[PDB]
Design an enzyme around this catalytic site. Structure first.
Site, mmCIF file in Angstrom:
data_model
loop_
_atom_site.group_PDB
_atom_site.id
_atom_site.type_symbol
_atom_site.label_atom_id
_atom_site.label_comp_id
_atom_site.label_asym_id
_atom_site.label_seq_id
_atom_site.Cartn_x
_atom_site.Cartn_y
_atom_site.Cartn_z
ATOM 1 C CB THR A 1 11.030 17.324 -4.540
ATOM 2 O OG1 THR A 1 9.844 17.098 -5.313
ATOM 3 C CG2 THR A 1 12.230 16.725 -5.265
ATOM 4 C CB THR A 2 6.030 16.560 -2.532
ATOM 5 O OG1 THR A 2 4.861 17.109 -1.913
ATOM 6 C CG2 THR A 2 6.010 15.021 -2.362
ATOM 7 C CG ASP B 1 6.965 15.147 -8.630
ATOM 8 O OD1 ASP B 1 6.250 14.575 -7.782
ATOM 9 O OD2 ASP B 1 7.431 14.564 -9.630
ATOM 10 C CG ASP C 1 10.588 12.399 -10.475
ATOM 11 O OD1 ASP C 1 11.727 12.912 -10.464
ATOM 12 O OD2 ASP C 1 9.540 13.076 -10.547
HETATM 13 N N1 LIG Z 1 -0.317 3.350 -3.110
HETATM 14 C C1 LIG Z 1 0.072 4.020 -1.998
HETATM 15 N N2 LIG Z 1 -0.471 3.746 -0.792
HETATM 16 C C2 LIG Z 1 -0.101 4.399 0.326
HETATM 17 N N3 LIG Z 1 0.832 5.368 0.333
HETATM 18 C C3 LIG Z 1 1.461 5.749 -0.805
HETATM 19 C C4 LIG Z 1 1.107 5.079 -2.063
HETATM 20 N N4 LIG Z 1 1.868 5.638 -3.022
HETATM 21 C C5 LIG Z 1 2.644 6.586 -2.435
HETATM 22 N N5 LIG Z 1 2.399 6.650 -1.112
HETATM 23 C C6 LIG Z 1 3.062 7.568 -0.151
HETATM 24 O O1 LIG Z 1 3.316 8.845 -0.747
HETATM 25 C C7 LIG Z 1 4.566 9.358 -0.274
HETATM 26 C C8 LIG Z 1 5.257 10.212 -1.332
HETATM 27 O O2 LIG Z 1 4.952 9.723 -2.639
HETATM 28 P P1 LIG Z 1 5.803 10.161 -3.935
HETATM 29 O O3 LIG Z 1 5.706 9.057 -4.961
HETATM 30 O O4 LIG Z 1 7.153 10.679 -3.498
HETATM 31 O O5 LIG Z 1 4.960 11.423 -4.471
HETATM 32 P P2 LIG Z 1 5.564 12.403 -5.597
HETATM 33 O O6 LIG Z 1 5.791 11.500 -6.785
HETATM 34 O O7 LIG Z 1 4.479 13.435 -5.794
HETATM 35 O O8 LIG Z 1 6.829 12.949 -4.978
HETATM 36 C C9 LIG Z 1 5.395 8.150 0.141
HETATM 37 O O9 LIG Z 1 6.074 8.411 1.374
HETATM 38 C C10 LIG Z 1 4.409 7.004 0.278
HETATM 39 O O10 LIG Z 1 4.356 6.523 1.626
#
Ligand SMILES: Nc1ncnc2c1ncn2[C@@H]1O[C@H](COP(=O)(O)OP(=O)(O)O)[C@@H](O)[C@H]1O
Ligand SMILES: Nc1ncnc2c1ncn2[C@@H]1O[C@H](COP(=O)(O)OP(=O)(O)O)[C@@H](O)[C@H]1O
Ligand SMILES: Nc1ncnc2c1ncn2[C@@H]1O[C@H](COP(=O)(O)OP(=O)(O)O)[C@@H](O)[C@H]1O
Ligand SMILES: [Mg+2]
Ligand SMILES: [Mg+2]
Ligand SMILES: [Mg+2]
Lengths: 548, 520, 546
Positions: free
Chosen positions: C96-97, C63, C402
């Site tokens: 945050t990303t 993150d 998170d």
């Molecule tokens: N299994 C999945 N399939 C498709 N898109 C996903 C999946 N998991 C996460 N995403 C996409 O990734 C984006 C950001 O993920 P996030 O969990 O916030 O990443 P991080 O934990 O690095 O912040 C989301 O907007 C979501 O649409």
């Protein structure tokens, strides 16, 4: 405890000398050192290959997608990588075709050898494995060959030869680049059908002169040659037919001065009065015998004096400068003249035949043209190559050298002996070499097996550079060679290959209708020199360097 | 084993630049966009100029793409492709260099986000190389086969974006006469050689039917000769007219003292014999590349014979084609027929420098005008502006093709590309439409320099192509958009073809590159 | 970019002066320079990174919250994105990303609008009308989370937060863990409003078996060592009393500035005895109360340890303030800062003691932890993470931390929306038809605002090393028909996104990925407020330090 003894008996040699044995994973590091520049070659093989910027210390830049050329400028530290440089340099000098392949294979044979040495195979058995694979590889290349040229000059056959060669280096458009070479090859060849004479062809005959400006579509094929010269006395369009004559002199058009202390000596006024007029009458008298033969242009080899120039342009004789040896020799082959250093009468049999000598604006500078006609053909033709960027002129010019080098491949062997391209020649050897490993017993079978795995890089590279997923395109192509008992007897599964652009799945609609093939003579020496590159690197178990 | 260190063997030399990653090709695009930003506001007549001073403190001012990039020593490898495109267009054409560089910049800048996506390099190049083939054919349809009405209008547009555009009413009248002196199929550029005159005002220039060359030396008997000949006769020489060694050597043995007087008189005898042969044919003007001594010029000064020397070979070749004579490097082979003639002769004071004027010939191949101005950059800008305009009217005589200026060619080509992309193949629809709106950068910046808003302009161009079939473009005078055929603004098609071919070749060169190696 | 400008030509400033579009370009490259490290970390296909402190120490982080906080940037335009990453971690705790990539592209795509002579005031107005139109469309397309009879509205929510982590493959096991943890530590406040305190659960840095065999504790786990080794480690039996003290129990001196002075040397020993006796009288009454386990914030002297070893009491020193409030809240005790009452006498009542079923001290790889389970009044929970080393567990600690914030929001607000760039692609089709209605110059601002929103689904395909335009074109085709759905469910071609492991477009409801709508709301406003801050700057004035 605070400090080691720092390798005692190290004063036997100098401090700068270092040893590098096979232990300590250093042979793995040498394979990794090959892997650094080998991955640079992955983006540069194929029609979708990407060129490379190489800025030298002087600042001279060359843009290129070939290996033998790019490796000349890079100063290399690792000696095992220099084996690939000189191996590709040997490929460019002899055949002038298939150097990315040498690097790609000699690098992947070291890659799969990383697995073999890690398993515990002795280095002596590894060389015996690839040598026995090499004898079977070169044997089967002669067996699965299809097609032949059988005619030195043809409009449609040369499209099958030149087009797959220049498709790697600066693909662009196919027709506008291929027609410039096929038209120029027919001019220089001594056809002479139904005579039984030996054919002959020179790489130095076809030469490309770089001129800035214009576009690639405006490029023309010149019968003669061209320089960026300026006539001294006067310019002439030469609208007079009834062809002119040509006389070539290698010495300067001036009084032959004495080599040992040529100095005037005048004892009295009678010699002072006649010495000024004697040089004028002497130079004029030599031009009378030259002018009466009907010559209207003389190519000089060195600097021409002003007094000799005054009598040449009197009768309208053109003067041309060629201050070098090779620039003067190439011009005699066009008109077929025999030079003589004497300032006397040219022999009528030795006088050349040139119809017209035009002077026009192409690149903004003065150029002199020597276009012949259909009658009284000539050799050593040139190709006017127009372009916008000087860097692109350099790489396209070397593509003509590769195409001209491919025409050399037809003269020495008995014929063309074309092979199917687009990975079909590589993927077929994988099944044949794999079957050969099953027939032979012993611990060398793994060396034969990994030798087949190394040949997958050509279809894997063309699938990666084409923007496709190699995990789906590669095993889809194996289904064409895993198959049996299918209807047609006259089997057409050999022409299946990869595809850069188009249909899904990828087995190409044959390399056939597409008219892309490979030369047998390129594949023979390429696999030979690539195996020698892997042999010399794997056979050595200790390396010694100095100063670094 | 021979050392406790065992250094790890680096592949490349020390100091070599970095390699593959993310942002290598993007840096080359940003490097080209950086150079493209400097040449950005110099487009069109309402643009600006660029002042550069190199390390040697040589001042220069210009609005050109070749001249600006020539003085700037560009060390970046990918950025020198622009120097090359510009130089190339100047060479083959001499006008529209900047346009080519801005178009090259926008195609590479438009290829930036596609490279950030998963689009390969060959896919972007295939789109431009397939689209440029239709643009060349479309420009052939936009261009006309005009033959009626018998130069004047083409020169006014080539002088734009620099000094003499406002003075086009006076310079175009005499600039058209410069190329009409040249016949077909020769088109010698050295005959249009023009020199520098620091001092004066540009308005006081005049048209000359011949040559005007600086003497560059003050002779002892220069003032004695008359400055005005009613029926002068020109004869070009090459022999050195002075007392010196004859032929590259000097060694004279003399035994008797009586003959020592005769050998000196023989040298005085032959030198006047060399001069008397020039006098007997009636050559009033004497010219030679080599120097002329004080002995010869004083012999010519007595009997009203003008002479001059210290001139270059390029100037001598212009003298022969102006007078229609020939070169004679020997005084004995002089005949009356090879002497050139003109109407009159008059040496005039021009900027504290003397020039020998020839004019009034019945058939003159030469046009050479004296460029007078305040600063050394004023005379330089008047030279480059005329050198760019003279190439346009030169090649207009080679072929009669005329297309609409003011950015009208880019919009008409872009509309058919949008129709061609709308029809077929799906994948390349984004690339061709990206090439379409990227090709509209020429009318984009052409109106931004004028101070007008780009949205109201660009919305008016697209929806008004139906009645504005082909001659629809921008008009700066009335602050409106209308037909360019009524305004008599013309421009050839060769600038457009070489611009797209050079710009397509420039962007495709480094688009097939994803590496950068820099030794030392 | 090209060259440095003139330094205070007839202006007389001690620092540097720059103006025009050059600094506006430097802000774009500044936001893109800090955003490139965030590009590769987006989505499940993204890879982690490591930051070295030039002392050997390193930390693995995915993150962009703590990555940009550690990267010390000196350009002030980049500091706003650094603080934006820290701001989004406080309120929402996820995404945050995404705000760094969205805010950078809005400035990058708006850079073309600057040289078109569109003023920034008109550009942000076109962005803001697109924003409130996008929020209402998000309020139309979302959905409540009771949703269905089965839960799995919480098992699927954890997969979105758990994706793009080292333990994303083990999210099937950890999905049941996080939902069982936050449902145990709920509370009551504001007369019916349920709250979920994040970080209340104890995340222990254990080493051992694996992340798959991480045992969920049914109760709170205190991370502290035992005082003496001769004490009983395991205490069985029901109704174990918990005492939570904070007063100073070790022997301390007199008042902060007094001096002990005495003439008679006979009582010199007696005053020494009562100072040693007055501290033991407090320990005497705790034994009379019968507290099996006692916890103290301050230290514990050896004079007190002898009484706990004799009476078999578990005395633990070196507790922290924030932990003991959760022990007293879970076990049912009350925090005792000092022993006193409204009356003048001093005593201790049994009502101050808590209750729990079992207390066991466990040790795993040099990590002593007191496992308190079976709280009668209110439940508690703790998660014992297990991995390779401490620096790998820091990514797991941030991954779990998170996950609690995301599962917190879906229970506080039942409305959710699908992932995979669905709403980012849906707003483009909604804003294109709205961009033509408004007419004048704001069409390009609303249009380029919509084009910048597509960067989220594009980055999923670029990092996947696959063909991106085919997935975007197919996602564009289905969303294009959603606006023209022609209602009469048969309202299909909506709630679809990218499936990167297979490379197809499928239904995200069945795939089991969701995200709360409130995260989309706050991320868009905070990304646009950061975009407003950078666009409105014209000229920089950097003053050198004295
Ligand atoms: N299994 C999945 N399939 C498709 N898109 C996903 C999946 N998991 C996460 N995403 C996409 O990734 C984006 C950001 O993920 P996030 O969990 O916030 O990443 P991080 O934990 O690095 O912040 C989301 O907007 C979501 O649409
Ligand atoms: N258009 C095409 N379609 C399929 N295969 C091609 C095409 N063009 C080239 N190839 C294949 O790519 C290979 C590249 O060979 P390469 O080593 O680059 O030749 P060169 O020695 O001229 O560099 C060829 O052997 C050929 O079979
Ligand atoms: N009188 C004019 N009216 C409208 N446009 C013009 C006029 N003259 C030149 N232009 C435009 O200016 C552009 C640039 O031409 P020019 O100034 O001659 O060279 P450069 O490209 O070096 O600036 C052309 O594309 C042309 O359309
Ligand atoms: Mg080839
Ligand atoms: Mg111009
Ligand atoms: Mg998340």
């Amino acid at each position: 405890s605070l400090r080691l003894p720092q390798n005692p008996n190290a004063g036997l040699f100098k401090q700068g000398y270092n040893s590098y044995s096979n232990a300590d994973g250093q042979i793995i590091k040498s394979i990794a050192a090959i892997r650094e520049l080998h991955q640079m070659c992955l983006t540069s093989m194929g029609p979708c290959g990407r060129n490379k910027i190489i800025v030298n210390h002087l600042g001279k830049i060359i843009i290129t997608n070939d290996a033998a050329t790019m490796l000349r400028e890079l100063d290399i530290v690792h000696p095992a990588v220099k084996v690939l440089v000189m191996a590709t340099e040997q490929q460019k000098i002899d055949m002038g075709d298939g150097t990315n392949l040498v690097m790609i294979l000699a690098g992947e044979l070291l890659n799969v050898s990383e697995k073999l040495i890690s398993m515990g195979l002795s280095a002596v058995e590894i060389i015996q494995g690839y040598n026995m694979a090499r004898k079977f590889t070169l044997k089967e290349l002669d067996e699965m060959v299809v097609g032949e040229i059988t005619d030195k000059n043809d409009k449609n056959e040369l499209l099958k030869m030149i087009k797959p060669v220049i498709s790697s280096k600066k693909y662009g458009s196919e027709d506008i680049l291929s027609e410039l070479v096929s038209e120029a090859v027919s001019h220089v060849l001594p056809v002479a059908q139904q005579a039984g004479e030996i054919p002959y062809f020179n790489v130095d005959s076809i030469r490309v002169v770089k001129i800035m400006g214009g576009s690639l579509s405006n490029s023309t094929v010149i019968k003669g040659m061209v320089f960026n010269r300026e006539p001294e006395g006067h310019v002439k369009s030469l609208s007079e037919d009834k062809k002119h004559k040509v006389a070539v002199f290698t010495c300067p058009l001036d009084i032959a001065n004495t080599e040992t202390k040529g100095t005037v000596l005048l004892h009295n006024a009678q010699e002072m009065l006649d010495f000024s007029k004697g040089e004028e009458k002497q130079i004029d008298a030599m031009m009378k015998e030259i002018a009466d033969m009907g010559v209207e242009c003389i190519v000089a080899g060195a600097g021409v004096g002003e007094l000799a120039l005054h009598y040449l342009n009197r009768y309208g004789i053109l003067v041309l400068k060629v201050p070098s040896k090779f620039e003067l020799r190439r011009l005699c082959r066009v008109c077929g003249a025999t030079p003589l250093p004497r300032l006397g009468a040219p022999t009528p049999e030795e006088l050349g035949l040139v119809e017209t000598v035009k002077t026009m604006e192409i690149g903004g500078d003065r150029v002199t043209v020597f276009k012949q006609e259909q009658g009284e053909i000539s050799r050593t033709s040139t190709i006017i190559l127009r372009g916008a960027t000087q860097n692109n002129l350099d790489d396209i010019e070397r593509a003509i050298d590769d195409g001209v080098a491919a025409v050399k491949g037809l003269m020495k062997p008995s014929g063309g002996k074309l092979l199917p391209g687009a990975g079909a020649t590589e993927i077929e050897l994988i099944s044949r070499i794999t079957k050969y490993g099953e027939r032979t017993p012993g611990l060398l079978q793994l060396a034969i097996k990994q030798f087949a795995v190394a040949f997958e890089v050509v279809p894997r590279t063309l699938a990666e550079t084409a923007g496709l997923d190699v995990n789906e395109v590669l095993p889809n192509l194996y289904a064409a060679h895993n198959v049996t008992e299918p209807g047609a007897v006259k089997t057409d599964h050999l022409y299946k290959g990869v595809d850069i652009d188009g249909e899904s799945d990828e087995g190409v609609k044959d390399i056939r209708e597409e008219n892309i093939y490979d030369m047998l003579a390129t594949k023979k020496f390429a696999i030979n020199v690539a195996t020698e590159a892997a042999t010399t690197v794997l056979s050595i178990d200790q390396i010694i360097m100095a100063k670094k | 084993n021979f050392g406790s260190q065992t250094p790890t063997i680096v592949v490349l030399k020390e100091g070599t630049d970095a390699s593959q990653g993310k942002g290598q090709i993007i840096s080359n695009i940003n490097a080209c966009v950086a150079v493209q930003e400097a040449l950005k506001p110099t487009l069109g007549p309402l643009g600006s100029d660029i002042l550069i001073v190199t390390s040697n403190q040589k001042t220069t001012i210009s609005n050109d793409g070749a001249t600006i990039l020539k003085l700037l020593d560009v060390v970046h490898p990918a950025a020198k492709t622009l120097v090359d495109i510009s130089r190339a267009q100047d060479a083959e054409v001499g006008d529209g260099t900047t346009s080519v560089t801005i178009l090259a910049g926008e195609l590479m800048k438009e290829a930036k986000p596609f490279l950030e996506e998963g689009i390969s390099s060959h896919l972007i190049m295939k789109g431009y190389r397939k689209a440029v083939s239709l643009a060349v054919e479309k420009i052939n349809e936009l261009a006309v086969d005009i033959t009626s009405e018998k130069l004047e209008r083409c020169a006014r547009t080539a002088m734009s974006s620099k000094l003499i555009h406002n003075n086009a009413d006076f310079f175009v009248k005499m600039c058209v006469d410069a190329v009409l002196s040249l016949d077909r199929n020769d088109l010698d550029d050295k005959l249009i050689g023009i020199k520098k005159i620091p001092g004066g005002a540009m308005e006081e220039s005049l048209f000359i039917n011949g040559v005007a060359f600086k003497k560059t030396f003050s002779y002892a008997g220069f003032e004695q000769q008359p400055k005005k000949f009613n029926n002068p006769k020109i004869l070009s020489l090459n022999v050195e007219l002075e007392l010196k060694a004859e032929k590259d050597n000097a060694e004279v043995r003399v035994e008797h003292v009586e003959d020592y007087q005769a050998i000196v008189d023989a040298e005085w005898q032959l030198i006047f014999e060399k001069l008397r042969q020039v006098e007997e044919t009636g050559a009033n003007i004497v010219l030679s590349k080599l120097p002329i001594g004080d002995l010869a010029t004083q012999f010519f000064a007595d009997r009203n014979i003008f002479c001059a020397g210290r001139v270059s070979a390029d100037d001598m070749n212009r003298v022969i084609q102006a007078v229609g004579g020939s070169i004679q490097s020997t005084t004995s082979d002089i005949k009356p027929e090879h002497l050139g003639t003109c109407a009159l002769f008059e040496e005039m004071q021009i900027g504290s420098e003397r020039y020998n004027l020839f004019q009034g010939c019945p058939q003159a191949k030469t046009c050479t005008l004296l460029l007078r101005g305040g600063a050394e950059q004023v005379i330089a800008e008047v030279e480059r502006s005329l050198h760019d305009a003279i190439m346009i009217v030169k090649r207009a005589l080679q072929n009669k093709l005329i297309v609409a200026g003011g950015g009208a060619t880019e919009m008409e080509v872009s509309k058919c590309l949008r129709d061609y992309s709308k029809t077929i193949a799906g994948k390349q629809q984004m690339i061709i439409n990206a090439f379409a709106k990227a090709l509209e950068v020429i009318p984009r910046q052409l109106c931004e320099n004028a101070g007008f808003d780009a949205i109201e302009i660009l919305n008016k161009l697209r929806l008004a192509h139906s009645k504005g079939e082909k001659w629809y473009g921008v008009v700066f005078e009335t602050e409106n958009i209308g037909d360019n055929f009524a305004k008599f603004v013309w421009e050839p098609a060769l600038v457009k073809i070489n611009a797209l071919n050079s710009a397509t070749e420039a962007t495709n060169l480094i688009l097939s590159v994803d590496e950068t190696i820099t030794n030392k | 970019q090209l060259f440095n400008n003139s330094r205070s030509d007839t202006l007389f400033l001690g620092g540097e002066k720059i103006s025009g579009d050059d600094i506006r370009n430097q802000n774009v490259l500044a936001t893109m320079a800090v955003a490139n490290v965030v590009k590769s970390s987006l989505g499940p296909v993204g890879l982690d990174k490591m930051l070295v402190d030039d002392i050997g120490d390193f930390t693995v982080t995915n993150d962009g919250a703590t990555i940009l906080s550690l990267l010390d940037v000196q350009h002030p335009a980049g500091k706003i994105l650094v603080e934006l990453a820290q701001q989004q971690d406080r309120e929402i705790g996820d995404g945050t990303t995404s705000v760094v990539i969205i805010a950078s592209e809005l400035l990058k795509r708006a850079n073309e609008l600057v040289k078109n002579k569109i003023h920034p005031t008109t550009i942000i107005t076109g962005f803001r009308v697109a924003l409130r139109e996008a929020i209402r469309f998000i309020n139309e397309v979302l959905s409540t989370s009771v949703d269905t009879l089965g839960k799995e509205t919480l098992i699927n929510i954890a997969k979105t937060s758990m994706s793009s982590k080292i333990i994303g493959a083990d999210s099937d096991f950890f999905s049941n863990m996080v939902v069982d943890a936050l449902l145990a530590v709920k509370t009551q406040n504001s007369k019916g409003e349920i709250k979920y305190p994040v970080k209340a659960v104890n995340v222990l840095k254990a080493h051992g078996k694996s992340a798959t065999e991480s045992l969920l504790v049914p109760g709170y786990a205190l991370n502290c060592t035992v005082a003496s080794q001769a004490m009983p480690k395991r205490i069985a039996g029901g109704n174990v009393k918990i005492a939570c003290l904070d007063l100073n129990l070790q022997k301390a001196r007199m008042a902060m500035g007094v001096q002990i002075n005495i003439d008679d040397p006979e009582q010199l020993e007696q005053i020494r005895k009562r100072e040693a006796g007055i501290v033991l009288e407090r320990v005497k009454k705790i034994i009379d109360a019968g507290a099996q386990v006692v916890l103290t914030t301050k230290g514990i002297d050896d004079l007190c340890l002898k009484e706990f070893v004799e009476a078999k009491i578990m005395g633990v020193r070196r507790c922290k303030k924030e932990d003991l409030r959760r022990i007293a809240r879970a076990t049912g005790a009350t925090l005792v800062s000092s022993m006193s009452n409204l009356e003048g006498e001093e005593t201790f009542e049994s009502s101050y003691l808590g209750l729990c079923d079992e207390v066991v001290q466990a040790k795993f790889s040099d990590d002593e932890c007191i496992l308190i389970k079976g709280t009668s009044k209110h439940s508690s929970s703790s998660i014992i993470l297990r991995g390779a080393n401490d620096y790998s567990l820091d990514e797991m600690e941030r991954s779990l931390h998170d996950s609690l914030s995301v599962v917190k929001r879906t229970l506080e607000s039942g409305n959710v929306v699908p992932g995979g760039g669905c709403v980012e692609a849906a707003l483009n089709i909604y804003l294109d038809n709205f961009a033509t209605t408004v007419g004048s110059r704001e069409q390009l601002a609303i249009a380029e605002f919509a084009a910048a929103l597509l960067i989220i689904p594009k980055t999923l395909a670029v990092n996947a090393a696959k063909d991106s335009s085919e997935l975007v074109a197919k996602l564009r085709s289905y969303h294009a028909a959603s606006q023209m759905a022609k209602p009469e469910k048969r309202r299909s071609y909506r709630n679809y996104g990218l499936d990167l492991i297979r490379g197809k477009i499928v239904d995200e409801i069945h795939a089991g990925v969701l995200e709360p709508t409130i995260s989309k709301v706050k991320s868009l406003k905070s990304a646009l407020e950061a975009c407003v801050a950078i666009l409105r700057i014209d000229t920089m004035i950097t003053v050198d330090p004295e």
